[PDB]
Amino acid sequence: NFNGLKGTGVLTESNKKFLPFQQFGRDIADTTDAVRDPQTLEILDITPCSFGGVSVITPGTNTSNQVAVLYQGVNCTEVPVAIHADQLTPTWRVYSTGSNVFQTRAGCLIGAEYVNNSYECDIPIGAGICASYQTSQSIIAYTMSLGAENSVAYSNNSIAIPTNFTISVTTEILPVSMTKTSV
Amino acid sequence: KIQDSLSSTPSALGKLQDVVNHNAQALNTLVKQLSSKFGAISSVLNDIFSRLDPPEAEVQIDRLITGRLQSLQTYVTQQLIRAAEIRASANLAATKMSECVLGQSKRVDFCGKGYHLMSFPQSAPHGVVFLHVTYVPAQEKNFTTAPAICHDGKAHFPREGVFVSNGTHWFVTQRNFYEPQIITTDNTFVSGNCD
Amino acid sequence: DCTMYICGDSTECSNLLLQYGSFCTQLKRALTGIAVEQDKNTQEVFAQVKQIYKTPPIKYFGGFNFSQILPDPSKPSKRSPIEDLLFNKVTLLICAQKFKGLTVLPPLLTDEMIAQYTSALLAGTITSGWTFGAGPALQIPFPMQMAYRFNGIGVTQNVLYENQKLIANQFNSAIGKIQDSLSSTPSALGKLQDVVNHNAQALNTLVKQLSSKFGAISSVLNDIFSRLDPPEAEVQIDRLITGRLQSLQTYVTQQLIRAAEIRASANLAATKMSECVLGQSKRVDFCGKGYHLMSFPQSAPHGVVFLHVTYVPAQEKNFTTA
């Protein structure tokens, strides 16, 4: 509440210069980014707290009720510190001290272990990580498998000619029109 | 096989099921915004005419009316964008029905994966389902090949086909099949000295 | 994140925002669909073949030079020199300023996997040809693929072999000139810079919009709560919340239009990759100015580059006809 300024945030030491008459500091969006303490002169940098999205990696309700909460775009040390009574907006704080904490480029997937094998991507975590439900059952996260490597040969004299064929059929569903409506 | 396939997996008709689902959700959320105050005393119309006095009765029912006009405007804009998407998709069916069905199209991976043979249109609720027939090679053998053959001091390029060899004899064959024939003048044409 | 953007960290604005109803749910649902479409665009543009072929150990492809395109072993990324320039020229504190509920989710396919896909596409077409797009890939010596690509022009095969070297020298000189010309012009990749600049300026305008008074006495929510008693205050905060709501809706609508444009471009790119690359096209002015021969995909930030090859008659002589 610096000199009558009701605001919430984190106060840290700032090296920015102040002109002698200047007191406050402002950014492009008219948000106060610096103050001078009335009692003692100093440079303080107001920075907002940590925030980020939360998702749920759940299989079908039929299959099971084991989930895997992904905390997106946050430094992973915070949710250890977030383990407290009435110190986190989500109520299910008890899950924070849950299963194996894993680290990704997009965030921490609290509730799933990382296997080292590669399979097809079922549920995409983000930035090259995909989760799945596998069997003693659990949600496991791994790296995508673009496909099985194939090594086609090559030489100054080599041709590969097919000797047999298989007539195949496929399908291609396409919308053609939507529901007419009026108001 | 097709009969069985669409009967087994339930995620096949996803495309046509998504359009009707989107329309149903849009209509449902449109007819659900009639019970929100939009920053007014109440969402009941005759109630908001009844209690508040005439000078600010409007300062409230204009709020309601412009809010509902904004909701209608959002629904209409969403429908114009969706209809543009459908029209983009609808013109990819007229072209497919024109080329794949009424002819043989040589555009790669347009009328199905592999070499195209024909197609069969079928109807579906608010859509269409094509049924492409394709020619896909499968078992292959590798032979030794040469660019040309000089016999009388002159080159001999293949008319239609490729020169291959099974280790003892040279043959000229087709490309997307295996049919060896003895190399003859009817399959070769000359293009100068072989040096 | 409406709550964070439209309203401040203050609790009071949250209730009034809830009174307006499901304005926000509609918005997140709208900007998630956009993200899914964005992922599917690259998925369908680059991943036509699901078998990841590997580059041949040696590079003696009948006199032709594929060094600037084929992966560079030196750098850990298989990005090749032409990709290395394209990545450098695109060049994409303001991101830190996005504390106001605005984020940029990462793409599902990282640059390494995109590079591997572009390497598979470009490493199957130099040893197999057009086959690997229809069924089982079959190898065929590379000089020969070319003479079965002249034959589609209407010119017999007796040109590429009969003048094998000159075509090789012309192709090498052409690829060098392409690299130099791409390096030169400041606006060669401009269009690509225009896309990212449009996105950046849209975000910047959306950030600056909350400084506007929007007809209210102030643009700071905490101060307007503190100085103004609540019954009158609700008017001014209604003005602010409505203004920022309209700004957010305008941003979402503009993003929808731009996403439709990008989706059309992505469909065109998929058609070009499945027609110019995996086969020889006969559509005039589709795969390059002239009689088309083949194409090379190359990755780039938020886009693709095609190196369309073509064959153009040169010196003419006139005669008498019957």
Ligand SMILES: *[C@@H]1O[C@H](CO)[C@@H](O)[C@H](O)[C@H]1NC(C)=O
């Ligand atoms: C007020 O605080 C300042 C800063 O420490 C000090 O210099 C000054 O003497 C104080 N005056 C009184 C009356 O406390």
Ligand SMILES: *[C@@H]1O[C@H](CO)[C@@H](O)[C@H](O)[C@H]1NC(C)=O
């Ligand atoms: C769960 O199983 C029931 C009974 O077989 C079935 O009706 C329902 O569709 C299933 N739902 C899911 C999500 O698997």
Ligand SMILES: *[C@@H]1O[C@H](CO)[C@@H](O)[C@H](O)[C@H]1NC(C)=O
């Ligand atoms: C969090 O910050 C620490 C301190 O620099 C760093 O070691 C760690 O890698 C960071 N983690 C993430 C996910 O950014």
Ligand SMILES: *[C@@H]1O[C@H](CO)[C@@H](O)[C@H](O)[C@H]1NC(C)=O
């Ligand atoms: C046979 O092909 C290999 C593969 O590049 C090449 O290095 C070699 O020179 C070729 N042989 C002849 C005689 O050209």
Ligand SMILES: *[C@@H]1O[C@H](CO)[C@@H](O)[C@H](O)[C@H]1NC(C)=O
């Ligand atoms: C080719 O494949 C078909 C597929 O079953 C098989 O029946 C046939 O025996 C194979 N060989 C020939 C020469 O057709």
Ligand SMILES: *[C@@H]1O[C@H](CO)[C@@H](O)[C@H](O)[C@H]1NC(C)=O
């Ligand atoms: C066919 O390919 C295999 C594997 O590359 C090779 O071992 C074999 O020698 C080839 N056949 C001929 C006739 O060269």
Ligand SMILES: *[C@@H]1O[C@H](CO)[C@@H](O)[C@H](O)[C@H]1NC(C)=O
């Ligand atoms: C090659 O084909 C000829 C044609 O009859 C046959 O006589 C010969 O045995 C074949 N050789 C091999 C190695 O298949």
Ligand SMILES: *[C@@H]1O[C@H](CO)[C@@H](O)[C@H](O)[C@H]1NC(C)=O
């Ligand atoms: C291809 O070009 C590079 C760079 O100019 C050169 O180092 C390399 O030797 C060339 N290779 C061939 C086969 O010409």
Ligand SMILES: *[C@@H]1O[C@H](CO)[C@@H](O)[C@H](O)[C@H]1NC(C)=O
């Ligand atoms: C066409 O050929 C004739 C002679 O054969 C020549 O006089 C005339 O200039 C030629 N046409 C053009 C446009 O040069």
